[PDB]
Design a protein around this ligand. Structure first.
Ligand code: CDL
Ligand code: CDL
Ligand code: WUO
Ligand code: WUO
Ligand code: MQ9
Ligand code: 9YF
Ligand code: HEC
Ligand code: HEC
Ligand code: PLM
Ligand code: TRD
Ligand code: FES
Ligand code: CA
Ligand code: CU
Ligand code: CU
Lengths: 149, 223, 139, 152, 299, 56, 115, 73
């Protein structure tokens, strides 16, 4: 009864902090913001990093990434944003990765825990994602020792 | 290493693509994206034999591994190159760490295990049932690295414990408790499985009461 | 009971010929040489019919004609006691429940259930074997 | 605790702590922390929903702003008979109670979907302070734990 | 008509297939003749030997006709001896292997897709040579005492790796591209369990085994040539698990010059679909399409 | 029921019975009345097996 | 078999998954061959063979009863794979190797089928 | 009961009135149907409850009809 069409294993999502998204014919995997934090917010004027992997569902043609916009700031794409015939485009170097990059210049503050909308535009497909912030493989920040009360 | 990366891709292509995709993006209703799951996820899933999966049901079981240690490293390196993620701890010689993962504070490990782990795995990692066909398994066969990466990656329905939620020293204390509660002998006789009242009540009825009634039959008469 | 022995001897002749032919034909012009599984199976099928046929043939040359071996025997030739045939027993179903307990234990790999099932099997088989031999209770 | 200390798909047990409770070095602090640990309506499950699953969240009336983004906080005390209902399945988003097998839907305000439980688990409103530490944003809006004749 | 008597057998696209189809049609006619005789004998006695209203005595109580008994064991023996002779002839022709095939294909089956590699091309007229083996990757599988003759069961060295490979995907049917008029050799290996290589228009299939040599399987077969261009479905024919019904492939047969152009495109880094579009072929499989990955209509 | 089957001269098969009470002139037992007590059903439980022979 | 045939009436998977269908042919073949036909041979033999040879009984009456009860409980053990979450054996009644090994058929249905 | 039906009828309690069993069956079926009210979101168990209730009602009805028509006593 557990092996029918509605199966518990097969609809399971990746146990990662980034988000999946369908941009027309592009699969956006592990989309997340890298933004090390110190207080309740990361303030406007900080430059944070937007990371993802774009996978070409089609295997016949090629594709290219344009115009990532958001209402947290402006996104600069550096490098060759074309995703090949049946290949990937790694944008940013994630936490444990031992050069397309997406730089976000912030205009309003962001905080770890909330989701933020980003609009990806390919030459065939364009969608909004609601991206989280992921501290990656960074260690736990020290907490000041509490006194006796 | 480029050789390790091409061996991992070559192994991946005839074992994992049908469910995970040629670009590790996932095949819908068949298997999830592997981008950012990391080498640690590959190590846990392949070294315990859960991957490659064979069908969809409530829960994919552990089973004999389909790959050896170097092939597991190759697959983990290939997955790590696509999205990064957590890695499996290593020792000085670059081997997967086993003994150095045993923490020094087993009392803290036991307290942490009872808070975080025993709800699903039982007082002494004997396993427990989950909702509908699922179950937290018996912990007595996992090696230290498997325990560590199981906490690190959150497999199937097991919660994910980040290195910020449970620091590496806390994880090492937990693995010390898990390993020592698996290797300690029973003190009061045969351990009866470690589940408590249900097998103890089974032992009373099938051993103690059967003996007592048989002795009564021997002493008494019929008719 | 010469026909009973003859049946198994005829089967034995065919099985022995088939085993020899198969081993020789697979050793020559068959990839890998002798096909060991089928050759072994044919040789020991031959052995099975040989054991039973030799037992029947030894029994036949001992006892002279039975009324069921005699072409014009009379029904009254077979008068007398035949033997013991158990009138009833609930021990067979207990034996099968015990063996099924041990089998479920082996399927799910529960060693305690396997132990319990083996103990049940031994107790049930003792119950069957002793059923018509227990004496009266003694007081 | 900080919101980035928990990954998506993680769950942590949290307790109500005040600055004045201290670190347990003094005798009085130790007694206060023992009272925190032993309070039967104290433990709370903090879960982090996967961002891809946030469109499936159904809010309870009066509790629409109790979550801090993708962080949700429910009482760890089961509403049936008070056991710690803490078997948290991250993919099904199901909270399983080990005692009598009640199951609560974490995406639908911890509403019971199986077992002897008829009532949802109480939600704790949460937020962060100026330093970025997770704090409670008020009290539970309903009594916590097993029911009784006098309730609601 | 040969189609009605073939009973759904495809016409065939190789000489071996045509010979097998002739054997099929002849054997079907023989079996239909025997069946018509026996069915007619059944219908005759059922129609004309039923108990009448005016018979009081029991029929003649015959139970033995020895010459007829002997005569009815010789005739079926003769028919099966004729059939055995022609069977042996055709299987000898179908399993025949030439020392110089003109295309050698590596077929790798796995759960649950196909990989086709081009091991070697040697056209008979000297117009095309290509050496595709990649032995710098077979050695990477060596796993090593070992449970089986010093090896762990993860050894995988028996598998073949080539420079030009078409890999099947759950979203792309693998298309194997072959030249018409040329002797093709297929070398079959499985990555895990037993699969089945069946192209119905070949009128032939073989099982695809893990470690065939240790199992005494001959994993190599040839077709002397493929006699027409086109597209032909292939299916897995050994139960291999969940997606046994959903791991099909296609054989695209093109003219030899187009095959040379396709191979040049693949050597130039093109994928299978774009290299097929470069020779004016449909880029995707046309006899079959990928199965929806949704588990069914209730999902 | 003793479990012993016997073939009569005309070919009938009969099982030998051990009566628990008096019998007829034909030899069939007189039917006994149930008295709320158990009834023997094995001839060995009535002593038919004897004893092995005294010794260690 | 009726379930399998209904699913095969149309292209596409209308109500069964692949896994359930594979279990269905495996267990249909197993039940029809080993739980219906093979024991019904001995059902017919028990019905009439002692009568046909003019015997009062079979040679071993309690062994005969044991054979029947072993049939019944073995068949129930194999069919009980269907009450597990994964389900019954799904590797065919012929159970080809290595599809049946612990790597490729991990469920408890296959082991229950074997025993 | 007669001793032809229950041989030890004069040694113990041997008769349960048929109305008790008919009513108990109907109430057990109704109880199976009322467990469709609950918190569970699946319907596989609803079909199992409906099927068991239907079998129980059919058995009670067959017994009642055959007693009314005199075919069983
Ligand atoms: C993990 C799962 C299992 C765990 C089990 C652990 C517990 C052990 C229980 C021990 C039973 C206590 C009996 C103590 C008596 C010892 C004294 C003695 O010699 O008794 C002779 C006694 C005869 O004296 P009696 O009272 O005059 O008998 C009346 C009639 O003669 C007889 O008239 P009857 O024909 O009506 O009765 C015959 C009856 C004989 O059985 C019995 O009557 C006893 C059965 C006890 C069952 C208890 C009730 C549970 C049912 C629910 O036939 C059977 O059922 C035979 C069963 C097979 C024999 C036991 C073999 C077990 C080996 C295990 C491996 O017969 C027996 O009890 C023999 C069976 C026991 C063999 C000795 C084993 C000792 C060691 C046990 C553990 C090792
Ligand atoms: C395996 C089954 C072997 C049985 C084949 C023998 C067929 C001959 C027919 C016959 O005489 O039936 C007598 C009788 C049938 O009663 P009946 O129809 O009233 O026949 C009365 C005779 O006319 C009057 O004959 P009787 O009352 O004098 O009794 C004759 C009986 C008297 O023999 C004895 O002294 C008792 C021997 C009992 C067998 C011991 C079973 C061992 C189980 C140990 C499990 C742990 C491993 O002799 C035999 O049955 C000769 C067989 C020799 C036994 C060697 C078997 C070794 C077991 C292999 C384990 C693997 O059957 C038996 O006494 C034994 C059959 C019990 C079947 C066992 C089923 C479960 C076994 C599972 C084992 C795996 C567990 C894990
Ligand atoms: C009047 C008399 C009353 C007295 C009765 C006394 C009898 C009991 C024996 C006496 C005790 C000895 C003295 C000191 C104790 C001792 O020296 O003890 C050593 C250790 O022993 C166990 O260690 C196993 C390994 O040695 C460890 O290596 C391993 O780690 C450990 O693993 C556990 O822990 C891990 C965490 O790391 C988990 O990973 C893992 O899963 C597991 O939990 C192991 O334990 P476990 O598997 O429990 O037992 C397995 C037992 C095997 O079963 C048992 O014998 C249990 C038997 C009792 C249970 C009774 C159940 C009854 C069931 C019902 C009848 C149900 C059926 C009814 C319904 C039917 C339905 C039909 C209608 O081993 C074997 O011998 C297997 C081989 C053969 C077994 C035979 C032994 C004796 C009996 C044989 C019977 C005849 C034939 C032979 C059988 C094959 C654990 O306890 C340890 O603490 C303990 O330290
Ligand atoms: C045999 C004897 C009788 C006659 C011969 C044969 C009769 C049997 C025929 C039954 C055919 C059933 C379908 C087979 C295929 C199958 O395998 O299933 C399909 C799918 O189904 C579920 O999807 C539903 C949809 O398809 C999805 O679109 C949808 O999304 C999903 O939604 C759920 O889940 C979501 C989250 O995911 C939530 O959002 C959402 O709210 C919801 O919860 C659905 O699920 P849901 O409704 O839960 O269950 C329902 C499924 C689930 O299968 C089932 O039939 C359940 C099994 C029923 C078993 C019947 C027991 C019979 C009783 C006993 C005989 C009594 C004892 C007597 C014995 C001897 C007596 C002698 C003394 O269909 C049905 O019931 C079909 C309806 C009819 C069933 C037949 C009842 C007959 C009995 C009545 C008459 C009494 C008898 C007469 C007496 C005289 C999921 O599981 C999927 O994976 C799965 O793929
Ligand atoms: C209300 C409720 C719980 C319902 C579920 C009931 C249910 C479906 C239970 C059966 C589970 C099974 C056996 C699953 C597989 C499917 C299957 C084979 C079913 C039966 C098929 C069948 C009827 C035909 C075959 C013939 C037959 C009757 C089979 C025998 C079945 C047997 C003997 C199984 C045991 C049944 C059972 C539930 C027993 C419980 C045993 C208990 C409570 C023991 C506790 C216990 C445990 C659990 C230990 O871990 C342990 C470790 C070390 C030492 C001791 C013990 C120990 O005793
Ligand atoms: C002590 C025995 C008492 C016997 C009394 C007789 C009463 C029998 C009633 C029969 C039970 C029917 C109720 C089951 C209704 C129900 O809720 O259960 C279903 C699961 O159906 C099943 O398997 C049916 C199993 C029925 C088995 C038959 C019962 C007889 C057993 C007990 C024999 C034992 C013999 C004794 C052994 C030892 C002693 C010897 C006698 C689905 O649940 P779930 O699991 O959530 O499935 C999800 C998907 O739905 C969803 O798509 C998605 O795929 C997932 O979410 C999936 O999880
Ligand atoms: C289909 C039958 C699969 C095959 C073949 C392989 N995987 Fe898989 N995998 C599959 C599912 C349905 C799931 C999700 C639920 C689960 O059982 O865990 C997975 C999961 C993984 C993971 C964990 C991902 C996470 O979120 O961290 C990994 C690392 C993984 N799979 C890897 C993997 C590899 C390396 C495989 C080839 C050996 C492989 N999988 C095969 C489905 C299927
Ligand atoms: C319930 C929600 C769980 C909690 C809390 C913990 N675990 Fe778990 N664990 C759970 C499941 C369902 C599974 C199986 C997942 C799979 O993909 O098959 C696991 C697995 C493990 C393992 C692997 C065991 C192996 O088979 O050897 C280990 C070592 C493990 N779990 C340990 C562990 C620890 C230390 C936990 C506390 C932090 C813990 N788990 C929590 C379910 C649940
Ligand atoms: C008797 C069983 C027939 C019904 C087949 C159901 C298969 C589903 C098992 C899993 O889940
Ligand atoms: C498209 C033509 C189909 C011809 C079918 C031939 C009929 C086969 C005979 C059936 C066998 C009768 C027993
Ligand atoms: S205490 Fe939670 S279900 Fe009973
Ligand atoms: Ca269909
Ligand atoms: Cu296949
Ligand atoms: Cu197949």
């Amino acid at each position: 009864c557990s092996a029918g069409q509605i199966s518990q294993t097969t609809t399971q999502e990746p146990a990662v902090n980034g988000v999946n998204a369908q941009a027309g014919q592009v699969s956006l995997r592990n989309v997340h913001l890298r933004a090390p934090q110190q207080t309740d917010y990361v303030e406007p004027g900080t430059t944070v990093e937007l990371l993802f992997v774009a996978a070409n569902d089609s295997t016949e043609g090629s594709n290219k990434l344009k115009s990532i916009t958001s209402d947290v700031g402006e996104v600069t794409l550096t490098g060759d944003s074309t995703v090949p015939a049946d290949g990937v485009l790694i944008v940013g170097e994630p936490d444990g990765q031992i050069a397309v990059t997406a730089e976000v210049e912030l205009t309003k503050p962001i905080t770890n825990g909330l989701l933020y909308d980003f609009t990806f535009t390919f030459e065939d497909g364009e969608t909004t994602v609601a991206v989280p912030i992921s501290a990656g493989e960074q260690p736990r920040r020290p907490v000041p020792p509490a006194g006796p009360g | 290493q480029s050789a390790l990366l091409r061996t991992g891709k070559q192994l991946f292509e005839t074992s994992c693509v049908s469910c995970h995709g040629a670009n590790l993006q996932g095949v819908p209703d068949r298997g999830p994206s592997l981008i950012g799951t990391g080498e640690a996820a590959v190590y846990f899933q392949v070294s315990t034999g859960r991957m490659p999966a064979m069908r969809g049901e409530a829960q994919a079981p552990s089973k004999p591994p389909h790959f050896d240690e170097s092939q597991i490293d190759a697959l983990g390196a290939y997955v790590q190159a696509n999205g990064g993620g957590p890695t499996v701890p290593r020792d000085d010689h670059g081997a997967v760490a086993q003994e150095s993962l045993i923490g020094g504070d087993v009392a803290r490990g036991g307290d942490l295990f009872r808070l975080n782990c025993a709800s699903c795995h039982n007082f002494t990692g004997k396993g427990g049932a989950l909702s509908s066909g699922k179950y937290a398994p018996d912990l007595g066969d996992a090696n230290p690295a498997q325990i560590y990466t199981a906490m690190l990656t959150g497999p199937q329905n097991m919660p994910k414990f980040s290195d910020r939620q449970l620091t590496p020293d806390e994880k090492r204390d937990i693995v010390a408790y898990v390993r020592e509660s698996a290797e300690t002998p029973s003190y009061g006789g045969y351990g009866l499985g470690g589940f408590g009242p249900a097998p103890e009540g089974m032992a009373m009825w099938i051993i103690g009461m059967v003996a007592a009634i048989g002795v009564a039959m021997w002493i008494g008469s019929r008719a | 009971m010469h026909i009973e022995a003859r049946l198994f001897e005829i089967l034995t002749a065919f099985f022995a010929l088939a085993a020899v032919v198969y081993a020789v034909l697979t050793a020559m012009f068959a990839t890998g040489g002798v096909e060991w599984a089928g050759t072994t199976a044919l040789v020991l099928t031959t052995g099975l019919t040989l054991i039973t046929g030799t037992f029947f043939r030894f029994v036949a040359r001992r006892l002279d004609t039975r009324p069921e071996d005699y072409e014009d025997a009379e029904i009254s030739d077979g008068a007398g006691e035949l033997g013991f045939f158990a009138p009833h027993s609930w021990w067979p179903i207990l034996i099968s429940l015990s063996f099924s307990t041990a089998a479920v234990g082996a399927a799910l790999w529960l060693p305690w259930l396997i132990a319990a099932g083996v103990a049940f099997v031994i107790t049930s088989v003792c119950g069957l074997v002793f059923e018509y031999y227990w004496g009266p209770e003694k007081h | 605790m900080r919101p980035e200390d928990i990954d998506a798909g993680g769950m942590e047990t949290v307790f109500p702590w005040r600055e004045s409770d201290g670190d347990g070095t003094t005798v009085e602090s130790e007694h206060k922390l023992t009272e925190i640990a032993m309070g039967v309506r104290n433990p709370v499950m903090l879960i982090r929903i996967k961002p891809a699953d946030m469109h499936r969240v159904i809010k309870r009336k009066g509790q629409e702003s109790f979550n801090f983004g993708e962080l949700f906080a429910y009482t760890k005390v089961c509403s049936h008979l008070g056991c710690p209902s803490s078997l948290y399945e991250q993919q099904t988003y199901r909270i399983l109670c080990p005692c009598h097998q009640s199951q609560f839907d974490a995406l639908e305000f911890a509403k019971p979907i199986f077992g002897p439980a008829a009532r949802a688990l109480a939600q704790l409103p949460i937020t962060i302070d100026e330093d970025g530490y997770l704090v409670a944003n008020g009290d539970f809006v309903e009594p916590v734990g097993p029911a009784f004749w006098e309730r609601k | 008509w040969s189609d009605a008597l073939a009973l759904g057998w495809p016409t065939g696209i190789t000489p071996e297939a045509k010979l097998n189809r002739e054997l099929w049609i002849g054997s079907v006619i023989a079996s239909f003749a025997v069946g018509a005789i026996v069915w007619g004998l059944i219908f005759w006695t059922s129609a004309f030997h039923r108990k009448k209203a005016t018979d009081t005595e029991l029929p003649r109580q015959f139970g033995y006709n020895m010459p007829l008994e002997l005569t009815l064991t010789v005739i079926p023996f003769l028919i099966i001896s004729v059939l055995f002779y022609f069977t042996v002839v055709v299987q000898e022709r179908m399993m025949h292997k030439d020392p110089n095939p003109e295309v050698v294909i590596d077929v790798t089956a796995f759960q649950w897709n196909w990989k086709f590699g081009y091991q070697k091309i040697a056209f008979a007229d000297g117009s095309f040579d290509y050496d595709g083996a990649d032995p710098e990757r077979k050695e990477a599988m060596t796993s090593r005492v070992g449970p089986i003759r010093g090896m762990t069961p993860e050894d995988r060295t028996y598998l073949n790796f080539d420079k030009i490979e078409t890999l099947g995907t759950s979203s792309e049917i693998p298309v194997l591209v072959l030249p018409a008029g040329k002797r093709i050799e297929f070398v079959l290996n499985s990555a895990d369990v037993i699969h089945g290589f069946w192209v119905p228009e070949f009128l032939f299939k073989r099982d695809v085994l893990p470690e065939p040599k240790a199992n005494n399987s001959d994993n190599v077969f040839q077709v002397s040539e493929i006699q027409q261009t086109g597209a032909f479905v292939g299916r897995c024919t050994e139960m291999c698990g969940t997606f046994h019904a959903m791991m099909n492939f296609e054989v695209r047969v093109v003219e030899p010059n187009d095959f040379k152009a396709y191979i040049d495109q693949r050597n130039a880094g093109k994928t299978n679909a774009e290299a097929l579009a470069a020779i004016n072929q449909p880029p995707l499989a046309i006899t079959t399409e990928p199965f929806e990955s949704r588990r069914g209509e209730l999902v | 029921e003793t479990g012993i089957i016997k073939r009569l001269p005309h070919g009938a098969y009969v099982e030998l019975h051990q009566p628990l009470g008096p019998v007829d002139e034909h030899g069939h037992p007189i039917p006994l009345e149930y008295a709320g007590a158990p009834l023997p059903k094995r001839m060995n439980k009535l002593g038919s097996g004897g004893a092995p022979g005294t010794g260690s | 078999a009726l379930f399998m045939r209904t699913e095969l009436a149309m292209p596409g998977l209308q109500f069964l998954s692949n896994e359930q269908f594979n279990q269905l042919f495996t267990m249909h073949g197993t039940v029809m061959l080993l739980f219906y036909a093979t024991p019904i041979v001995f059902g017919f033999a028990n019905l009439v063979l002692p009568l046909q040879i003019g015997a009062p009984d079979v040679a071993f009456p309690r062994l005969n009863a044991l054979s029947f009860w072993l049939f019944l409980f073995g068949a129930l053990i194999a069919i009980a794979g269907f009450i597990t979450p994964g389900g019954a054996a799904d590797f065919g009644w012929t159970a080809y190797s290595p599809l049946t090994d612990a790597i490729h058929s991990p469920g408890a249905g296959g082991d229950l089928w074997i025993m | 009961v007669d001793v032809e039906d229950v041989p030890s009828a004069e040694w113990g309690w041997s008769h349960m009135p048929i109305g008790v069993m008919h009513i108990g069956g109907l109430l057990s079926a109704a109880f199976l149907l009322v467990m469709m009210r609950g918190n569970h979101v699946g319907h596989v168990e609803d079909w199992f409850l409906i099927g068991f209730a239907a079998v129980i009602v059919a058995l009670v009805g067959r017994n009642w009809w055959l007693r009314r028509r005199g075919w069983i006593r």
